[PDB]
């Protein structure tokens, strides 16, 4: 039979059968209970709208993501999300399909063990396998080397790989991602008068960020230009009218990636953690990693980031090496495409964690040889 | 049929059919297992890359030479190296070709006996013969007398020969060679800030030594000059950028040959063990040995060694004798060229150790008349 390539993610759940080009169903991972009282009788009001249904009734819900930073903080809601994904968005019972979840690097063990225990006890799948979210993004590019920066919505991690041999001592995981950029944008919009507070209006700020923000090639020059002319002010129409005008908030929101001091984080930007991740590698594979830097994940879709990052790394790196940044147009679904490719391989067909194996060793089987 | 003139060496395996000018395939003798985990499935990852293949994937391997000082310390790896040499670099099955290995003087017997046992049982050659690495280097020079200093990469030995009669009591074998010079260079580079530790970076230090180091004609004057001017500082680009500048480390690394007290060895340099080897000979053949001093082996390729050695010996020797140092441009492959010449001789065709002879007397046949 065919395998189910699910990809929990944090912000958008992407799923679909193995062997295709794009995920079949992509929908936000939010579960929102209603918060008001409700007076109409017999309206058929449910107790929790999940997935894309709660992005249409969000006016009277309190949306809450079940995955904070890679890790899962609310297991009941995550179980509800998985149940919805299997039964309503794909309509395939899990009793007859292997599953291939994905997990960020350096995550707590208990999260992974609970994930496999749920998949084997509640949904009762035949066999499931957990894979690191960066190796798949490297599969999708058709490479076999390269250092991949997978800046998702929950957590940004940077896994270097050479000739198929991952370097476990050079993984640099940073917890700045799309959600923190949304919060920072929502916080700097208040400088013009627009106040978004409700958890429903966070979605509106996210839409503003997606449609308007861009990464500046040079930050100081843009700050000077936006403060003199008015060629940058782009307007946007809220879900009820009252258009708003975003000035130099456009390139200040995604600039947080390269200067995490804006949101008070100490660490260095995504332009310098990649160079540090390279320098921890051996001295003989640094040229190949320099030449095959891969971008993935949703948050790396800002217009103009593949040039800013290249300029920064070229500034840091030695002058002789060639710096090349692979930015495929299908960046958002790169991890899932790689997952489909991996699940479609014949050599991989014996790596699944078969159910009888789980019955013999318990949930701690995932840390064992079947990784 | 044609004979296979293999030459194990220590650092570079040189092989080729008898009767040519240069070895057909020359490649480092290193076998490196991968050390990281490996996440890509179906990449076709082997368990051990040998020869020149492991000098390209050395970023994720742990290279380890199977020959320490002439002697062989890891027989399985040496067998693997031989198998590679026969089947992939020459593509001739050994069942139809005599072989002519080479061995340093004064080596343990068990090494030679195991070598012949392997060649007769595993590879199943028709007949093999083991020859001393210095007599061949004397063949290649077209001489018949002379004292040859064969400073390889494993061990430096100094065999005097007169009129074809070797003098077994005057062989002076010293264990300082190219590998110790590589280690000492890697140890003195730390005085400027460059730290090379990994077994892969030993190859980079070896490349630095080959391309930059030279032997000073007079040591104290060079030490004084390099400490005042800056006309010696030559720069070199690592495999990833970050050029380095070598100062007076240039002529201090190969100076260890003439002052083995630098690496803590007690013995005298290669300039004085040759004179001692001569003085052990009879009083009537010392003039001929003085006039026909032969250099061979890789490590004697330093720019300016044929003058330093001549100056030193002229200082030691009596003033009347003429000191001449033969330094052919084809120094590195001198032993193999001599091996080809010896294997191509008609008079030598009945000295091979035929397989039926080995079957009758066991591996201890090599010490017998068929030397």
């Amino acid at each position: 039979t065919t395998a189910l390539v699910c990809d929990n993610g944090s912000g958008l759940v992407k799923a679909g059968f193995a062997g295709d080009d794009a995920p079949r169903a992509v929908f936000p991972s939010i579960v929102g209970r209603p918060r008001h009282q409700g007076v109409m009788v017999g309206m058929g009001q449910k107790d929790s709208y999940v997935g894309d249904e709660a992005q249409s009734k969000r006016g009277i819900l309190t949306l809450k993501y079940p995955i904070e930073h890679g890790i899962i903080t609310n297991w009941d809601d995550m179980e509800k999300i998985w149940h919805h994904t299997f039964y309503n968005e794909l309509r395939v019972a899990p009793e007859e399909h292997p599953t291939l979840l994905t997990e960020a690097p350096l995550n707590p063990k208990a999260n992974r063990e609970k994930m496999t225990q749920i998949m084997f006890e509640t949904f009762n799948v035949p066999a499931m396998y957990v894979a690191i979210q960066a190796v798949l993004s490297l599969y999708a590019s058709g490479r076999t080397t390269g250092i991949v920066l997978d800046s998702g919505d929950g957590v940004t991690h940077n896994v270097p790989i050479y000739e198929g041999y991952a370097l476990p001592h050079a993984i640099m995981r940073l917890d700045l991602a799309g959600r923190d950029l949304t919060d920072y944008l929502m916080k700097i919009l208040t400088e013009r008068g627009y106040s978004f507070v409700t958890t429903a209006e966070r979605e509106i700020v996210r839409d503003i960020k997606e449609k308007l923000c861009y990464v500046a090639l040079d930050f100081e020059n843009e700050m000077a230009t936006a403060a003199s002319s008015s060629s940058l002010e782009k307007s946007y129409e809220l879900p009820d009218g009252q258009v708003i005008t975003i000035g130099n908030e456009r390139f200040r929101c995604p600039e947080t990636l390269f200067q995490p001091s804006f949101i008070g984080m100490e660490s260095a930007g995504i332009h310098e953690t990649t160079y540090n991740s390279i320098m921890k590698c051996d001295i003989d594979i640094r040229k190949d990693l320099y030449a095959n830097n891969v971008l993935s994940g949703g948050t790396t879709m800002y217009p103009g980031i593949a040039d800013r990052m290249q300029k920064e790394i070229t500034a840091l790196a030695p002058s002789t090496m060639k710096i090349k940044i692979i930015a495929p147009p299908e960046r958002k679904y790169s991890v899932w495409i790689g997952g489909s490719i991996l699940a479609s391989l014949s050599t991989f067909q014996q790596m699944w964690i078969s159910k009888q194996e789980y019955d013999e060793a318990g949930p701690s089987i995932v840390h064992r040889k079947c990784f | 049929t044609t004979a296979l003139v293999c030459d194990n060496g220590s650092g570079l395996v040189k092989a080729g059919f008898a009767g040519d000018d240069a070895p057909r395939a020359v490649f480092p003798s290193i076998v490196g297992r991968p050390r990281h985990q490996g996440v890509m499935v179906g990449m076709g990852q082997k368990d051990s890359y040998v020869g020149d293949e492991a000098q390209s994937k050395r970023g994720i391997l742990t290279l380890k030479y199977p020959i320490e000082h002439g002697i062989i310390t890891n027989w399985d790896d040496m067998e693997k190296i031989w198998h590679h040499t026969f089947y992939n670099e020459l593509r001739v099955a050994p069942e139809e070709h005599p072989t002519l290995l080479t061995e340093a003087p004064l080596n343990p017997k068990a090494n030679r006996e195991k070598m012949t046992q392997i060649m007769f049982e595993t590879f199943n050659v028709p007949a093999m013969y083991v020859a001393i690495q210095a007599v061949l280097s004397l063949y290649a020079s077209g001489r018949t007398t002379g004292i040859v200093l064969d400073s390889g990469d494993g061990v430096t030995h100094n065999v005097p020969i007169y009129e074809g009669y070797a003098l077994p009591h005057a062989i002076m074998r010293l264990d300082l060679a190219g590998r110790d010079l590589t280690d000492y260079l890697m140890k003195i580079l730390t005085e400027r800030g460059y730290s090379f530790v990994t077994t892969a970076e030993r190859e980079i230090v070896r490349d630095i030594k080959e391309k930059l180091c030279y032997v000073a004609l007079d040591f104290e004057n060079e030490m004084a000059t390099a400490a005042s001017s800056s006309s010696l500082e030559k720069s070199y680009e690592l495999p990833d950028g970050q050029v380095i500048t070598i100062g007076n480390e240039r002529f201090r690394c190969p100076e260890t040959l003439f002052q083995p007290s630098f690496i803590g060895m007690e013995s005298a340099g290669i300039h004085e063990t040759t004179y001692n080897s001569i003085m052990k000979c009879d009083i009537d053949i010392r003039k001929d040995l003085y006039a026909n001093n032969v250099l061979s082996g890789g490590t004697t390729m330093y720019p300016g060694i044929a003058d330093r050695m001549q100056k030193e010996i002229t200082a030691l020797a009596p003033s009347t004798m003429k000191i001449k140092i033969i330094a052919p441009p084809e120094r590195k492959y001198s032993v193999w060229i001599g091996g080809s010449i010896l294997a191509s001789l008609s008079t030598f065709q009945q000295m091979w150790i035929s397989k039926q002879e080995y079957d009758e007397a066991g591996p201890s046949i090599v010490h017998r008349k068929c030397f």
Partner: peptide, 20 residues
Amino acid sequence: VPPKIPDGERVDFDDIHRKR
């Protein structure tokens, strides 16, 4: 110990043509 992937045959970077 870290997992050990069994050795296969082929391929990679050859499906980029057939999917692009």
